[PDB]
């Protein structure tokens, strides 16, 4: 599939930390996702979670934030 639900990440495989759900919805949607929210708890801790983020945009994958 061309889209997936996951933590959006930067080119260094680092999540985008968040303080507001709105920050994440904006960040996610401007990058092509349908919506987004802030996770204060999750597989990789605090960070923005995006719904249906296109695969030309990075997501947090196993490994370290480098």
From Swiss-Prot:
Phosphoprotein recorded as keyword: no
Origin: domain of life: Eukaryota
A GO biological-process term: defense response
Tissues in which the protein is found: Expressed by the venom gland.
Effect of residue 66 to K: 1.9-fold decrease in toxicity to mice, and 11.5-fold decrease in the binding affinity for insect sodium channels
Subcellular location: Secreted
Consequence of changing residue 62 to G: 1.7-fold decrease in toxicity to mice, 1.3-fold increase in activity on Nav1.5/SCN5A, and 1.7-fold increase in activity on insect sodium channels
Keyword annotations of the record: Cardiotoxin, Disulfide bond, Ion channel impairing toxin, Neurotoxin, Secreted, Signal, Toxin, Voltage-gated sodium channel impairing toxin
GO cellular component labels: extracellular region
Domain LCN-type CS-alpha/beta: start-end pairs: 4-66
UniProt effect for mutating residue 30 to E: 4.1-fold decrease in toxicity to mice, and 14-fold decrease in the binding affinity for insect sodium channels
Reported effect, residue 54 to S: Not tested in mice, 1.2-fold decrease in activity on Nav1.5/SCN5A, and 16.9-fold decrease in activity on insect sodium channels
Effect annotated for changing residue 62 to A: 1.1-fold increase in toxicity to mice, 5.8-fold decrease in activity on Nav1.5/SCN5A, and 20.4-fold decrease in activity on insect sodium channels
Result of changing residue 45 to A: >47-fold decrease in toxicity to mice, loss of activity on Nav1.5/SCN5A, and 56.7-fold decrease in activity on insect sodium channels
MF-aspect GO terms: sodium channel inhibitor activity; toxin activity
Additional free-text comment from the UniProt record: Exists in two forms, due to cis-trans isomerization at 28-Pro-His-29.
Domain remark from Swiss-Prot or TrEMBL: Has the structural arrangement of an alpha-helix connected to antiparallel beta-sheets by disulfide bonds (CS-alpha/beta).
Function: Alpha toxins bind voltage-independently at site-3 of sodium channels (Nav) and inhibit the inactivation of the activated channels thereby blocking neuronal transmission. This toxin is active against both mammals and insects, and is classified as an alpha-like toxin. It is active on Nav1.2/SCN2A (EC(50)=139-252 nM), Nav1.3/SCN3A (EC(50)=565 nM), Nav1.4/SCN4A and Nav1.5/SCN5A (EC(50)=195-500 nM), Nav1.6/SCN8A (EC(50)=214 nM), and drosophila DmNav1 (EC(50)=30 nM).
Name of the molecule in the record: Alpha-like toxin BmK M1
Residues of the full protein shown: 20 to 83 of 84
């Amino acid at each position: 599939n061309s889209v997936r639900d996951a933590y959006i990440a930067d080119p260094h495989n680092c999540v985008y930390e968040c303080a507001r759900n709105e920050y994440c919805n904006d960040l996610c949607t401007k990058n092509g996702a349908k919506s987004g929210y802030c996770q204060w708890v999750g597989k990789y801790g605090n960070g923005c979670w995006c719904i249906e983020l296109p695969d030309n945009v990075p997501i947090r994958v196993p490994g370290k934030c480098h």
